[PDB]
């Protein structure tokens, strides 16, 4: 389950969560933003219950690239209660992210 | 002296152009963008007449992006007769610039 959000929906679907959200900023032109479309997708199912992974595409979501400092995709931020806690920036190994992932919960 | 093009602009601006054209593909959040915006100009002049500089907001030509493989941004592309003879993906320093522009124009 990840979901694809909005400028609009960013309120509701990230920063109201309680769950921890990782949020995954990409565009379709964007070669290392799909190349890690696999482990999310695995990720996402890992981390069920403990992580929710939220994807925001750039071209219909400029306003909130802008908003959060995006400044290079990949970009993936760490949400915790609404703020942001945390950040990869630029395509990392599996490895990488786990560590991220499990230092930031 | 930069031309800003539109999906639907496209051909008419770059692919029927005769004269060497560098395309670079650029989006308002993206930082190496303005990183290298400086340098676009300064080479707009340098070369004027010999090559021309067009840009790329992918925000609202995304179908372009995707069409011509830019793998992320900034990407310049350099078109001759329509075609993609060179790529240069990432902000590089002006001297790079420079020797790309001349190595194929």
Redesign the interface.
Same mark, same amino acid.
């Given at each position: 389950t990840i979901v694809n959000t909005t400028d609009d929906n960013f309120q509701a679907d990230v920063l109201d969560a309680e769950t921890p959200v990782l949020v995954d900023f990409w #565009?379709?032109?964007? #070669?290392?933003c799909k190349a890690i479309a696999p482990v999310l997708e695995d990720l996402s199912s890992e981390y069920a219950g403990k992580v929710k992974i939220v994807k925001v595409d /750039?071209?219909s979501c400029?306003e909130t #690239? /802008?908003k959060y400092n &995006?400044?290079? &995709?990949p970009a993936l931020l760490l949400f915790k209660n609404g703020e942001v806690v945390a950040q990869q920036i630029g395509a990392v190994p599996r490895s990488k992210l786990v560590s991220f992932i499990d230092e930031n919960v």
């Open positions: #565009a379709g032109w964007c #070669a290392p /750039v071209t400029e #690239a /802008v &995006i400044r290079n &995709i």
